[PDB]
Amino acid sequence: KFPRVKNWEVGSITYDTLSAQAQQDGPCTPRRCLGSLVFPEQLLSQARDFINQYYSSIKRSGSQAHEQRLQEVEAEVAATGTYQLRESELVFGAKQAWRNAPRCVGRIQWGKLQVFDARDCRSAQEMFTYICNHIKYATNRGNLRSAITVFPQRCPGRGDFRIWNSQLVRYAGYRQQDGSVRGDPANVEITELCIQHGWTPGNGRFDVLPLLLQAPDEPPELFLLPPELVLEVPLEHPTLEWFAALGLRWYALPAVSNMLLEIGGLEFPAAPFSGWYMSTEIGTRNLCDPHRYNILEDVAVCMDLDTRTTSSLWKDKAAVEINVAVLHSYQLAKVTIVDHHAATASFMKHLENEQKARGGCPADWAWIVPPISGSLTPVFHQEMVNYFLSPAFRYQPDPW
Amino acid sequence: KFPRVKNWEVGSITYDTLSAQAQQDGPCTPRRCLGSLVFPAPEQLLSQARDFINQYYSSIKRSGSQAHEQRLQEVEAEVAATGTYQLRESELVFGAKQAWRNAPRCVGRIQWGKLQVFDARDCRSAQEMFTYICNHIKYATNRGNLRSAITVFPQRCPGRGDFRIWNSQLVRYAGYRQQDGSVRGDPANVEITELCIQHGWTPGNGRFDVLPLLLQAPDEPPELFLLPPELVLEVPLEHPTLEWFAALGLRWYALPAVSNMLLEIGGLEFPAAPFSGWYMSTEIGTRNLCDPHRYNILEDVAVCMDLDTRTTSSLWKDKAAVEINVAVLHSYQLAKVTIVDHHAATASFMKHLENEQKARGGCPADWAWIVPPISGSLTPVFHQEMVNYFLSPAFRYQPDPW
Numbered sequence A: 001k002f003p004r005v006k007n008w009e010v011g012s013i014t015y016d017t018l019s020a021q022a023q024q025d026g027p028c029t030p031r032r033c034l035g036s037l038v039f040p041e042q043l044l045s046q047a048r049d050f051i052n053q054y055y056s057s058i059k060r061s062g063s064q065a066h067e068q069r070l071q072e073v074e075a076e077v078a079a080t081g082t083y084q085l086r087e088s089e090l091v092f093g094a095k096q097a098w099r100n101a102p103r104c105v106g107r108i109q110w111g112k113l114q115v116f117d118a119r120d121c122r123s124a125q126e127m128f129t130y131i132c133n134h135i136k137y138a139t140n141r142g143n144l145r146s147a148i149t150v151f152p153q154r155c156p157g158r159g160d161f162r163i164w165n166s167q168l169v170r171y172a173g174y175r176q177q178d179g180s181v182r183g184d185p186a187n188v189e190i191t192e193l194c195i196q197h198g199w200t201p202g203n204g205r206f207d208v209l210p211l212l213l214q215a216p217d218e219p220p221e222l223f224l225l226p227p228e229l230v231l232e233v234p235l236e237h238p239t240l241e242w243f244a245a246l247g248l249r250w251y252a253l254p255a256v257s258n259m260l261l262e263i264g265g266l267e268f269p270a271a272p273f274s275g276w277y278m279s280t281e282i283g284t285r286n287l288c289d290p291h292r293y294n295i296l297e298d299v300a301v302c303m304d305l306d307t308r309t310t311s312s313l314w315k316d317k318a319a320v321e322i323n324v325a326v327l328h329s330y331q332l333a334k335v336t337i338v339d340h341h342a343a344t345a346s347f348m349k350h351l352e353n354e355q356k357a358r359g360g361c362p363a364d365w366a367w368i369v370p371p372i373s374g375s376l377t378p379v380f381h382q383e384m385v386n387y388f389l390s391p392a393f394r395y396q397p398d399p400w
Numbered sequence B: 001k002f003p004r005v006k007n008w009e010v011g012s013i014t015y016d017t018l019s020a021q022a023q024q025d026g027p028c029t030p031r032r033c034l035g036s037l038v039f040p041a042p043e044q045l046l047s048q049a050r051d052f053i054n055q056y057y058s059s060i061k062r063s064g065s066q067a068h069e070q071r072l073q074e075v076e077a078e079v080a081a082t083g084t085y086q087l088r089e090s091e092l093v094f095g096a097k098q099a100w101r102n103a104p105r106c107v108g109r110i111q112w113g114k115l116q117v118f119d120a121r122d123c124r125s126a127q128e129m130f131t132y133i134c135n136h137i138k139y140a141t142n143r144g145n146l147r148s149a150i151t152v153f154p155q156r157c158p159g160r161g162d163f164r165i166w167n168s169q170l171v172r173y174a175g176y177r178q179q180d181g182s183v184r185g186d187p188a189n190v191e192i193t194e195l196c197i198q199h200g201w202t203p204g205n206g207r208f209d210v211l212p213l214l215l216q217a218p219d220e221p222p223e224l225f226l227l228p229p230e231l232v233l234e235v236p237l238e239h240p241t242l243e244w245f246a247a248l249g250l251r252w253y254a255l256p257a258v259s260n261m262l263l264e265i266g267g268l269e270f271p272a273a274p275f276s277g278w279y280m281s282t283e284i285g286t287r288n289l290c291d292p293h294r295y296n297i298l299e300d301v302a303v304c305m306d307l308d309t310r311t312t313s314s315l316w317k318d319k320a321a322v323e324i325n326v327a328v329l330h331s332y333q334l335a336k337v338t339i340v341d342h343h344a345a346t347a348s349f350m351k352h353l354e355n356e357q358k359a360r361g362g363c364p365a366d367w368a369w370i371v372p373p374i375s376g377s378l379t380p381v382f383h384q385e386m387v388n389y390f391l392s393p394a395f396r397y398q399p400d401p402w
């Protein structure tokens, strides 16, 4: 019943006892595995379970404080149909949701999270102020600091706070007259949403999009990020002197803004969180994916590689140098970045910590293994168990 | 409904209706996915036999024919009289091809229709096993123009032990455990090496000593057979521009021939049915040579490339691994031994997926095994959602017979 989990490089065996606590059901069944798919008063039970989790974590289970808190949440839900987290519980909840995220290789950091409490927020203008403060704090002039800002929870009879943008920093993607894209093809939809809401578009490949911020029951409002708040890194290569001329750039801060934060049955549809980049996200996925910037063959051309035969591994050589350029450029710019070897090594340490702390760790193998040099990293050889724990970050529908 | 399956590179969406035909269960439950784990009654025989006969007669466009109905009745009668039944030669060939076609962890399945099936169900001894195995190796190797082949030894039957090939592949390099814990040779083969020594093999002392075969005839201890060196085609590894790479003395063999899996067709089990194709270069260059628990050459190659190995962010591991894969591809092409790189192989697997969507409404595929171990997202299969499930005919894992 407890899955046996093996590391094939060392031969070590663990049993994941934590998965027995999985709440939501995942997409797999005994008949077929869908692990590779990207997208697959009951409040009182989830609330009680969360309070118990928290008071267990702080070694206060069954204490007067524990029982007092349980009675308070019961009284709130009975009186109001919902309840409010204490600040300490909010901070614990956000950290746990990160800790529980199966697709995050960066969870060695999960205990170090700045939690900005924006639950008093009203109006998109206030939202923007909170978001700018978050960006400022998290960017920290390149010495990036993981942070989350939590906007008011969902409640009956009132619309949600929503950030329409998938991230706080996104590059525009402009559909061209012939169906191609200038800029980031991942952002065509949000780009034309910004334009339809009054944004004057640019004409460039790396135009930072405005933010579309939705206060409850209002249309989204456009907010322009002050340019000095959006740290970017021009990409250069340590020995390929022509790389800099390609004018490639990426931004310092990965800040996911479209996921729902769920804590104790409470739902925060706007809770943008940020850390720092793992270099393969930029150099391999964002720049080399065929449906993203797709610059691999451009770089291969500039490297004089034999692009007439796949067996020259010209694609692999070009991608590696793009990843080198990303790492070199962020380090030169003094912007926090982690390469995929360091990140996976730390994630192995995290798995070991979590085995001792909780008896296991939900982990999505396809997402944890980096998109280049998979088996050069230790996580490739590590069997993993994927399951859903709460508190959690969840996908949610786009607010349109 | 059925699983909806997206390709994220193109945006195309299909539904895997074939998954609804999955007979055996995998390891996942709604509570937790175990997809990344390597190793997760005459009436059931009749249902599996009936299903397979139906598959066969569908495949040749003969469903409902007098031949179809006659075969169903013959199998039912034979099972009732004898407890088992015997495949017709054409059904064995279809079943072997289907088992390959059904193999979720095989990226080279575009080739599934081109399989030479050697019928060794008449084999009576370990000596004759070796004769069949040597003929398989000679045929499949084809002086480097490799040909996919399977040799099917007699099925499991009550009253008699199994035919078994103890070795996991027909070609394996010895792994000699050294007293300090290290391994000379291939650390993946330490156990079969010690078994070979236990059964009277005089070991070598090199890193690329081809192991003898331990062949088990029914109810018999395994018997040791040495492969004639001229039968085992090997490729010395050199690099087109790293001239010192050749001095590493690295080699690999031409023929990937898996010999420890069980072939299951229509409820019949063939515990000895070695099959072979040709290598994808990442199996050799990335896994076999660069895995820390295999030949583990990555740092020595990176140092000889004078890369800076003191920090991970120079991506020295990545650079050395690419050049080792280059060396494998170059060396196989130079030796005129069939090999496919991971770009070509994954592109052809995408064609296979498209072919199978039209032919069967889906394709069982194990994402973690299909996506190559370097340059994953540079290949189209990384962006392809996949559904993993078990169809029969099948190649299955089985316990080691010791």
Ligand code: HEM
Pocket: A094, A098, A101, A103, A104, A105, A106, A107, A109, A113, A146, A147, A148, A273, A274, A275, A276, A277, A278, A281, A338, A343, A367, A393
């Ligand atoms: C501190 C450095 C961090 C690193 C290096 C890191 C690394 C990563 C990477 C590489 C991914 C996969 C992203 C992709 O492929 O698009 C990811 C996903 C994720 N990260 Fe982290 N992360 C960090 C911090 C954080 C923080 C602070 C949070 C939340 C408070 C977080 C929550 C998540 C979640 C929820 C996902 C999964 C999103 C999804 O399921 O689509 N991460 N992270």
Ligand code: HEM
Pocket: B096, B100, B103, B105, B106, B107, B108, B109, B111, B115, B148, B149, B150, B275, B276, B277, B278, B279, B280, B283, B340, B345, B369, B395
């Ligand atoms: C024709 C050229 C072929 C190529 C390029 C190819 C490629 C591959 C590769 C790269 C793997 C993964 C192996 C590993 O990572 O250790 C694999 C697995 C597999 N192949 Fe193929 N293959 C070929 C032919 C065949 C043939 C002829 C058969 C059977 C008749 C076959 C059946 C299988 C099976 C059953 C597996 C999975 C074994 C397991 O689950 O452990 N393949 N193949």
Ligand SMILES: CNCCc1cc(F)c(F)c(-c2cc(C)cc(N)n2)c1
Pocket: A106, A167, A254, A255, A256, A273, A274, A275, A276, A277, A278, A281
């Ligand atoms: C589809 N769901 C969003 C997944 C996603 C997309 C993305 F583009 C990112 F950049 C990060 C991400 C987030 C954090 C906090 C750190 C980091 N390195 N990456 C996560």
Ligand SMILES: CNCCc1cc(F)c(F)c(-c2cc(C)cc(N)n2)c1
Pocket: B169, B256, B257, B258, B260, B261, B275, B276, B277, B278, B279, B280, B283
């Ligand atoms: C029991 N699990 C076996 C998995 C495995 C291991 C291995 F070392 C291989 F080489 C192949 C393999 C097999 C074929 C026919 C072609 C090819 N390219 N690889 C398959």
Ligand SMILES: C[C@H](O)[C@H](O)[C@H]1CNc2nc(N)[nH]c(=O)c2N1
Pocket: A036, A037, A038, A366, A367, A368, B008, B382, B383, B384, B385, B386
């Ligand atoms: C189809 C497949 O699940 C998809 O391409 C996945 C693969 N693994 C991934 N892994 C990470 N970290 N991020 C991703 O976007 C993806 N995409």
Ligand SMILES: C[C@H](O)[C@H](O)[C@H]1CNc2nc(N)[nH]c(=O)c2N1
Pocket: A008, A380, A381, A382, A383, A384, B036, B037, B038, B368, B369, B370
């Ligand atoms: C733990 C993990 O499943 C293991 O390392 C897998 C990953 N994917 C693989 N993919 C292939 N093709 N071959 C393998 O041996 C493995 N090993």
Ligand SMILES: [Cl-]
Pocket: A254, A281, A286
């Ligand atoms: Cl990103």
Ligand SMILES: [Cl-]
Pocket: B256, B283, B284, B288
């Ligand atoms: Cl191999």
Ligand SMILES: [Gd+3]
Pocket: none
């Ligand atoms: Gd020139």
Ligand SMILES: [Gd+3]
Pocket: B241, B242, B243
């Ligand atoms: Gd030279």
Ligand SMILES: [Zn+2]
Pocket: A028, A029, A032, A033, A034, A035, B028, B032, B033, B034, B035
């Ligand atoms: Zn699964």
